[PDB]
Write a protein that binds this ligand. Structure first.
Ligand SMILES: [Zn+2]
Length: 237
């Protein structure tokens, strides 16, 4: 299709849009439920029972509810992110998936609908240990095989976001089947630091189920897609 993610964020294709209203991120930590191994990555699921939890502002016309968030990574610290800023890739990327509760009846419908999703991409980079992320890291040994899960309890995703909220925005798609073109992408310019050891833990999850050939979970990212005729906006000058 034409609008497919991920892409390569290049300085030259960006156009500041001074019309973008500031982005207001506010999540209810109490809405957290469980972490689990989807078979493609690990995800933290939230209870989206009609709550203020979610995002608004920016390129979004209305509030979108937090449904879940996952991570993408490589077999090495040298690559792993889905997006790339001017040819550069990071060791991992966080995807905070929100669904347009205003236009669609449910997440299953929004995810494949015309304006059903809004995802914030946050690049991860080696650096200082990350406290908030440790909570998650601490339960991964419980979810090695696909389909396995564990209960959670009060977690604020915002703790995984950079202080500076400058972003790039463009129309995209899911980077996993059905690959629907229903995503308004909000990619954050400023990466968040984590320690090698936190990242190494990621690489112990498995693509395979219980009692199957041990198939390690690495390089679970999708190849770069052409920008095409789409408009890549900058919230910053
Ligand atoms: Zn993703």
């Amino acid at each position: 299709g034409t609008r497919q993610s991920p892409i390569n964020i290049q300085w030259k294709d960006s156009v500041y849009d001074p019309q973008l209203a500031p982005l207001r991120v506010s999540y209810d930590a109490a809405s957290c439920r469980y972490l689990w191994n989807t078979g493609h990555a690990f995800q933290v699921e939230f209870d989206d029972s009609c709550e203020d939890s979610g995002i608004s502002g920016g390129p979004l016309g209305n509030h979108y509810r937090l449904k879940q968030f996952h991570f993408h990574w490589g077999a090495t610290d040298e690559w792993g992110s889905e997006h790339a800023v001017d040819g550069h890739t990071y060791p991992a990327e966080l995807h905070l998936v929100h669904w347009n509760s205003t236009k669609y009846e449910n997440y299953k419908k929004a995810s494949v609908g015309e304006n059903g999703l809004a995802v914030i991409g946050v690049f991860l980079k080696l650096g200082a240990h990350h406290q908030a992320l440790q909570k998650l890291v601490d339960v991964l040994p419980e979810v090695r095989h696909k389909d396995t899960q564990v209960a959670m309890g009060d977690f604020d995703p915002s703790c995984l976001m950079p202080a500076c909220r400058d972003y790039w925005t463009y129309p995209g798609s899911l980077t996993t089947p059905p690959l629907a073109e229903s995503v308004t992408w909000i990619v954050q310019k400023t990466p968040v630091e984590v320690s090698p050891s936190q990242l190494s833990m990621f690489r112990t999850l498995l693509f395979s189920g219980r009692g199957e050939e041990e198939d390690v979970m690495v390089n679970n990212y999708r190849p770069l897609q052409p920008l095409r005729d789409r408009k890549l906006r900058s919230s910053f000058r």
